[PDB]
Design a protein around this ligand. Structure first.
Ligand SMILES: [Zn+2]
Ligand SMILES: [Zn+2]
Ligand SMILES: [Zn+2]
Ligand SMILES: [Zn+2]
Ligand SMILES: [Zn+2]
Ligand SMILES: [Zn+2]
Ligand SMILES: [Zn+2]
Ligand SMILES: [Zn+2]
Ligand SMILES: [Zn+2]
Ligand SMILES: [Zn+2]
Ligand SMILES: [Zn+2]
Ligand SMILES: [Zn+2]
Length: 261
């Protein structure tokens, strides 16, 4: 029992719980369905306003976080932006940035260090603990990287196609390249030829889709490309299981390393 913390979505909950080292109680706004386009409910906003601290990933994703001001209401709350001053990257083809930072383990460690630095500024008593826990995270996240950097170096092919384009940072970590499919749901006889040419050019043996994807899109994908489907998890929603955040990242990069080697 300590500071009452409430987080936006899963990865923030996980990072705050790993940095806090169970020093205090942490909760998460239960974001039904999508977190990428979601404005909070009455209970959620009222409960974050009655909490010791509420932390969110970035203003480029949780736009509704900047609409808060405890000074003009119940002001028990400290609003922390876990990714303040991080180096995000514009989206190709165009100001909009790609907020999917947390999928890169080293960038996840960067965000965890920021979280620890901002949480020790609010909880002096236990700063030595925060800085400690985070510094262990950085180590693990580092080890993980060194575990996969070589097998992705030996990787024959370094490109993967996905229905969910949320892995730019994970790809840049290991020198890979992600691409997207240009057919969504009933494709034309011309779009079919184009997709065949695309699958040929890039020698695509498998198309990746969001975890718990819809069946209607998977069916048309398999029918249009002619290849099987594997699953990648953006961790936008807590996959209820007993695995640690870095283990959930290792899962994604294991799937990738198997497909590419
Ligand atoms: Zn208290
Ligand atoms: Zn989604
Ligand atoms: Zn997303
Ligand atoms: Zn910001
Ligand atoms: Zn950075
Ligand atoms: Zn001290
Ligand atoms: Zn404390
Ligand atoms: Zn490195
Ligand atoms: Zn399903
Ligand atoms: Zn869990
Ligand atoms: Zn491991
Ligand atoms: Zn899993």
């Amino acid at each position: 029992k300590g500071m009452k913390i409430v987080t936006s979505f899963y990865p923030i909950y996980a990072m705050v719980k790993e940095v806090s080292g169970d020093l205090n109680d942490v909760r998460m706004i239960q974001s039904s369905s999508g977190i990428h386009s979601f404005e909070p409910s009455a209970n959620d906003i009222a409960a974050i306003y009655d909490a010791d601290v509420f932390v969110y990933h970035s203003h480029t994703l949780e736009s509704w976080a900047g609409s808060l001001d405890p000074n003009l209401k119940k002001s028990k709350v400290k609003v922390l932006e876990a990714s303040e001053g991080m180096t995000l990257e514009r989206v190709p083809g165009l100001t909009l940035y790609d907020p999917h930072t947390w999928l890169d383990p080293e960038k996840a460690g960067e965000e965890a260090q920021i979280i620890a630095d901002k949480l020790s500024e609010v909880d002096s008593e236990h700063k030595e603990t925060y800085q400690k826990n985070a510094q262990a995270f950085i180590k693990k996240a580092q080890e993980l990287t060194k575990k996969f950097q070589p097998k992705f170096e030996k990787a024959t092919q370094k490109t993967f196609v996905t229905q969910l384009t949320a892995f730019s940072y994970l790809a840049k970590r290991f020198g890979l390249n992600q691409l997207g499919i240009a057919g969504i749901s009933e494709p034309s006889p011309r779009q079919l030829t184009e997709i065949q040419e695309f699958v040929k050019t890039y020698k695509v043996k498998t198309i990746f889709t969001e975890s718990n994807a819809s069946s209607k899109v998977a069916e048309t994908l398999v029918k249009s490309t002619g290849v099987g489907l594997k699953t990648l998890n953006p961790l936008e929603s807590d996959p209820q299981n007993d695995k640690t955040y870095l283990e959930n990242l290792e899962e994604n990069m294991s799937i990738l390393a198997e497909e590419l080697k």
